[PDB]
Design a protein around this nucleic acid. Structure first.
Lengths: 110, 98, 82, 166, 83
RNA sequence: UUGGGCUACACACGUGCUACAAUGGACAAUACAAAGGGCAGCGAAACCGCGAGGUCAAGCAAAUCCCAUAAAGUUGUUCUCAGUUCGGAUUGUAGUCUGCAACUCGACUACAUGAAGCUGGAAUCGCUAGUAAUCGUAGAUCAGCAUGCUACGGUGAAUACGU
């Protein structure tokens, strides 16, 4: 909903309309619209039924879904299952390369 | 203040003592931006108990030190110095005419 | 990363060569920082020298979100109170 | 619709050791319920939203159990409805409500005698009417009734009338 | 049913499968399983996504999506080369 | 000698960096420097690639050849005041280089995700003209690696009564 997935804004350009869905950025949007030969032009959702089929289906080429949230969940779940020496540093504020905690209180912690 | 101790390990006992004392200056005025303490065992070899203290003030600051036999005597002797080194300042008293 | 590609110290692998064909072992001591998991090491145990003392880690099935070089980071509780 | 009733009717009829038709379940009471800890301006958007989900109104319960810990007493709350006549038999098709991750149709059993039901969630859309204009969403407590005395009878019944178990 | 607390509906069209009536009932637009259901109380024309047959839940199990491709990729990846 | 650690974090101090936006963000075309490195190092063009990079190989111990193309800006288009195309931390996925070796502990590329934050409170710091402020450039330290240091330029004002 509207065309695809969930939570589309109305009367907004394609340039970011296709991006509020969980998994599209900015270039990938430009690709998928380039596939159905569509573009806004300029600040607004001008969409009729004409391009509606392709924008409803061409969006299906990826897992732009809560299944991507599911992808995250199952992957971190694979991490902390094993021993796991990075699921421990997954809680400190540390990615797998390290970040040297002195002023990282912080947004991955409180 | 970086209450650091050269060749003496700052306990909580020492921190408590120190901060406790400077609390008394809330008489004037605290206003607590910062404060420091340098303490050291400098062998003579009678060998010390050195105390040097720093007070940053409103629009100014006042350092203070002193040596004595032991830490507690050094903190008590250096006291009654960084009070009169502070008191007075102001007032100063109005004009011009004309 | 690595230059195409995965690798081993070529003594550890040469050891598990002797360990892995017969009735396998549940015991390997090592140092193992320049070597990492892949499906020949399965069914065995390892104990990488952390820096003070090795400690057992048994190779389980999908130990793939994980590697050989570390399993209990030598910062070791924590380093921090909280 | 009840055109399906004659289908799953006979599937159940062969299922159990029935020997006559009046031994059979039936589409019976559906009811809505809502509620709050308290509402002073909220309840209007609630029972209005219900007044669009269903094209007929609902009730306005008051309080009887002496509550003096969450708020005072007689603070109005709730909104029950009786969606009971073949209209009900048209509401039952209204399941189109895969919203976000609707994969949990809750086989976990309702009341242990011929009530196996689901207490659902989300005003966002109800298989219809994606409004995209809320002041506030709410869960939709919903129960369900069938004329029988054991729950698996209903499980088989409504499952064979296109419910998911899991 | 009382008179004055019951709202109603319109908009617009009925079917192409049965006799060309409108039985005060639905008209459901989908794409996955395009059934033009006249099965819906309030108002017929509706632009929806599922017919309870798209996904593998209402109808039941369906290989409607893969939903498998992730597993096999990295498996042969660390099957051949990784970690 | 092999491995760890010198980098852990409830926190605090200093110092710097980056955001809190239309004087602007996104995108297309286009003009301008200084300095200085290079021997097996500088790797021209071409070729591959979403790019990091990979292939090839002309030239050159330099007024030459290469490194290396300046950014701010100018021309336009759009965005039209949102926590927004602000924002850019976070975490994962897939990769490039180096290193025998990038997990504690290298950088970078592609995809996604989008935290806080609307100019900062009391208090407090520098600066008198090409200065401040801002945008770039190279060099060392070097296998790899600078929000740092040193050096180079581009653009570029307000104030200075009086003591």
């Amino acid at each position: 909903a509207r065309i695809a997935g969930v939570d589309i804004p109305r009367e907004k350009r394609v340039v970011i309309s296709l991006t509020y869905i969980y998994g599209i950025g900015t270039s990938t949007a430009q690709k998928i619209l380039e596939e159905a030969n569509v573009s806004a032009d300029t600040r607004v959702k001008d969409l009729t039924d004409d391009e509606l089929g392709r924008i409803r289906e061409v969006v299906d080429g990826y897992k732009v879904e809560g299944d991507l949230r599911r992808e995250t969940n199952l992957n971190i779940k694979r991490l902390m299952e094993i021993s796991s020496y990075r699921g421990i540093r997954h809680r400190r504020g540390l990615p797998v390369r390290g970040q040297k905690t002195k002023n990282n209180a912080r947004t991955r912690k409180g | 203040f970086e209450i650091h101790g050269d060749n003496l390990t700052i306990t909580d006992a020492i921190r408590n003592y120190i901060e406790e004392k400077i609390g008394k200056l809330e008489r004037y005025f605290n206003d607590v931006p910062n404060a420091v303490a340098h303490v050291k065992v400098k062998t003579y070899s009678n060998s010390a108990t050195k105390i040097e203290v720093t007070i940053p003030l409103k629009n100014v600051t006042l350092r203070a030190e002193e040596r004595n036999d032991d830490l507690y005597a050094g903190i008590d002797l250096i006291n009654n110095k960084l009070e009169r080194q502070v008191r007075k300042y102001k007032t100063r008293i109005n004009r011009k005419s004309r | 990363s690595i230059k195409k590609g995965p690798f081993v110290d070529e003594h550890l692998m040469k050891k598990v060569e002797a360990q892995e064909g017969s009735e396998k072992k549940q015991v390997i001591k090592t140092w193992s920082r320049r070597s990492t998991i892949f499906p020949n090491f399965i069914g065995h145990t390892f104990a990488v020298y952390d820096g003070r003392k090795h400690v057992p880690v048994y190779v389980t099935e999908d130990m793939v979100g994980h590697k050989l070089g570390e399993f209990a980071p030598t910062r070791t509780f924590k380093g921090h109170v909280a | 619709k009840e055109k399906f009733n004659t289908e799953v009717t006979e599937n159940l009829m062969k299922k159990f050791n029935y020997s006559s038709v009046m031994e059979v379940p039936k589409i019976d009471k559906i009811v809505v319920n809502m509620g709050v800890g308290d509402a002073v301006q909220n309840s209007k958007v609630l029972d209005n939203a219900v007044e669009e989900l269903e094209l007929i109104t609902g009730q306005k319960p008051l309080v009887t159990k002496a509550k003096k810990s969450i708020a005072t007493f007689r603070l109005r709350e709730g909104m029950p409805i009786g969606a009971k006549v073949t209209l009900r038999g048209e509401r039952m098709y209204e399941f189109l409500d895969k919203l976000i991750s609707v994969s949990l149709p809750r086989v976990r059993d309702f009341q242990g005698v011929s009530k196996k039901a689901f207490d659902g969630r989300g005003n966002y859309t109800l298989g219809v009417k994606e409004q995209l204009i809320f002041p506030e969403i709410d869960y939709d407590k919903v129960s369900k009734v069938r004329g029988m005395d054991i729950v698996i009878v209903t499980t088989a019944n409504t499952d064979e009338e296109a419910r998911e178990l899991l | 049913m009382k008179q004055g607390i019951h709202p109603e509906y319109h908009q617009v069209i009925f079917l192409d499968t049965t006799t060309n009536f409108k039985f005060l009932s639905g008209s459901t637009k989908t794409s996955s399983e395009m059934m033009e259901w006249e099965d819906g109380k309030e108002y017929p024309v509706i632009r929806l996504d599922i017919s309870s047959d798209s996904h593998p839940f209402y109808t039941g199990r369906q290989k409607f999506a893969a939903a498998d491709g992730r597993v096999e990729r990295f498996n042969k990846k660390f099957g051949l080369k990784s970690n």
